[PDB]
Amino acid sequence: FDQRLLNTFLERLFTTRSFDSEFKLACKVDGHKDIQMPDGIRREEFVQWVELLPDTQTPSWLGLPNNAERVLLTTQGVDMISKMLKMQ
Amino acid sequence: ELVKGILPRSWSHYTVPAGMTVIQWVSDFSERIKQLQNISLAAASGGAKELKNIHVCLGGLFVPEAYITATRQYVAQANSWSLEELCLEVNVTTSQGATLDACSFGVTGLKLQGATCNNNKLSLSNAISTALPLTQLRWVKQTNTEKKASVVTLPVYLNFTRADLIFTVDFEIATKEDPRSFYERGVAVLCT
Numbered sequence A: 001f002d003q004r005l006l007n008t009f010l011e012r013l014f015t016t017r018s019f020d021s022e023f024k025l026a027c028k029v030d031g032h033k034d035i036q037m038p039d040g041i042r043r044e045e046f047v048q049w050v051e052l053l054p055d056t057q058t059p060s061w062l063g064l065p066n067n068a069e070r071v072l073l074t075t076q077g078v079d080m081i082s083k084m085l086k087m088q
Numbered sequence B: 001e002l003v004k005g006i007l008p009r010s011w012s013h014y015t016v017p018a019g020m021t022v023i024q025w026v027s028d029f030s031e032r033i034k035q036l037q038n039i040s041l042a043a044a045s046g047g048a049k050e051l052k053n054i055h056v057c058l059g060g061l062f063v064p065e066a067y068i069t070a071t072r073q074y075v076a077q078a079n080s081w082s083l084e085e086l087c088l089e090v091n092v093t094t095s096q097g098a099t100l101d102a103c104s105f106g107v108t109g110l111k112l113q114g115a116t117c118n119n120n121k122l123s124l125s126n127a128i129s130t131a132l133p134l135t136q137l138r139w140v141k142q143t144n145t146e147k148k149a150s151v152v153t154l155p156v157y158l159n160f161t162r163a164d165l166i167f168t169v170d171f172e173i174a175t176k177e178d179p180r181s182f183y184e185r186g187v188a189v190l191c192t
Helices: A002-013 A043-051 A066-086 B022-044 B048-053 B064-079 B179-184
Strands: A024-026 B086-093 B104-108 B111-118 B121-131 B134-141 B151-157 B165-173 B188-190
Touching: A002 B179, A066 B121, B022 B048, B064 B086, B064 B134, B064 B165, B086 B165, B121 B179, B151 B179
Parallel strands: B121 B165, B151 B188
Antiparallel strands: B086 B134, B104 B134, B111 B121, B111 B188, B151 B165
């Protein structure tokens, strides 16, 4: 099933459609908007596009459900509480 | 070990998630033994016929994958067919509204992850887990018709670690959901 998931990403991304002006790298990241295939043809334009990526990254960027990080984030926040209390 | 709440190595026989306390294991072990008592109770009182008609918890079985092979072999013997000629059909229904036919076996404790099952049809969900009331496994002769372009093959693991693969299940997706989205969201079934 990991092989099937890897094949799904490869067939979704490596296609002639990737050279289209409306290609979607990710779909419905927050229910409404989607990540757009940059229209540039030079490396500099692609690098700029990465720099303008919003900091609001969610697991839906990866095709995962948005709640997959909820348990991980809560545990990390409690750990950050613990680390402070360990150095007081 | 017990004083440090460490599961003794002499007790760990069946497959267990690495992170399990002796307390959790004792509760899990008690549930497994209770189920084994009922299985032996039916076997002694009734014989093999009761063993076929009793619902089983795949989590409580020490080797759940062997039960699937046993049910596969049982149907093959009753119909004089080969194992490789039998494909597994899954029907999810309420325990009260369930009827077990010759090839049907009842399984309880199966939990769907990231999806809900409604009228034997899968839909993407924002809930972490969904408890399947009663899963019926049917072994029928293979028709080598491939898939209906709306069927996903969900892995069934033993526990949340997804380390041991028990078997696979074919489900029909609902509406116009993309089967690829099911693969990307990690939708699977857990035995416990």
